[PDB]
Design a protein around this ligand. Structure first.
Ligand SMILES: Nc1nc(=O)c2ncc(C(=O)NCc3cnn[nH]3)nc2[nH]1
Length: 261
């Protein structure tokens, strides 16, 4: 049965959140596949169902808990459980539709949302963009409560979507990028919430293209440079994998690696 990582916003310190992110990366990647020192997530093709997900049990100071399911192939939050109900984002394809049946299997009340969980959708539903949604231990504490009270009608759909946007970035994006992990640690250290600045938003937006560029690179070198933003929104060209080693922690599997040469 699928591995669970626990995290609580109640204790929270930079140490406990680091321990949390590090254990999520640890269950996401196997160590089989590392390219230019960056781990690659498992290939979805031929990945057996018993290896497909991880679970992240989130608790909060209000004594509630909720369990998110992450897909190990892309680190995406696919769904969540709170007590007796589970909800899943609308699947992209038939294979994902079947795969999600293997989650939360004894829950009474299982629902699939009619909408997908990509940021663009969540952001319409929330009536707010990532750039205007504050992140930190307080947002997370409140996201946990919001997800936990959805089934009883207590949480409005825009707050639901906002709450996922919070969880996705604080968990899946932080697992993807050391840089994003460190942004969160800052928020937790000073106990202040704040919205992600362009340096975070551009990394999130670029994860898939960065993954492809790295895996397609010639000995590290990008065929086409990729534009990121710094905190003040200015351009930063990435020409090479080397500059990303302290920034990106995990990549999505695009292709088998070429023979080392
Ligand atoms: N539930 C969920 N979990 C995630 O971990 C996640 N990560 C990135 C994006 C996103 O829209 N990223 C940009 C993108 C662009 N095209 N597809 N995705 N959405 C997500 N949603």
């Amino acid at each position: 049965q699928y591995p669970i990582i626990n995290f609580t916003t109640a204790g929270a310190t930079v140490q406990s959140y680091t321990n949390f992110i590090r254990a999520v990366r640890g269950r996401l990647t196997t160590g089989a596949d590392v390219r230019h020192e960056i781990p690659v997530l498992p290939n979805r093709v031929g990945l057996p169902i018993n290896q497909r997900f991880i679970l992240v049990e989130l608790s909060n100071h209000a004594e509630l808990s909720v369990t998110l399911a992450l897909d190990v192939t892309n680190a995406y939050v696919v769904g969540y459980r709170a007590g007796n109900s589970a909800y899943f984002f609308h699947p992209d394809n038939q294979e994902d539709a079947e795969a999600i049946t293997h989650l939360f299997t004894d829950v009474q009340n299982r629902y699939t949302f009619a909408f997908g969980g990509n940021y663009d959708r969540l952001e319409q539903l929330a009536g707010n963009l990532r750039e205007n949604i504050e992140l930190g231990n307080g947002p997370l504490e409140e996201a946990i409560s919001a997800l936990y009270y959805y089934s009883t009608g207590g949480t409005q759909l825009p707050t639901l979507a906002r709450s996922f946007i919070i969880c996705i970035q604080m968990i899946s994006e932080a697992a993807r990028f050391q840089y994003i992990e460190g942004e969160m640690r800052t928020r937790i250290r000073y106990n202040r919430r704040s919205a992600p600045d362009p340096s975070v938003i551009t990394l999130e937006n670029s994860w898939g293209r960065l993954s492809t560029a790295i895996q397609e690179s010639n000995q590290g070198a990008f065929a086409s440079p990729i534009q990121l933003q710094r905190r003040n929104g200015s351009k930063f060209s990435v020409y090479d994998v080397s500059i990303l080693i302290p920034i990106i922690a995990l990549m999505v599997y695009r292709c088998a690696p070429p023979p080392s040469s």
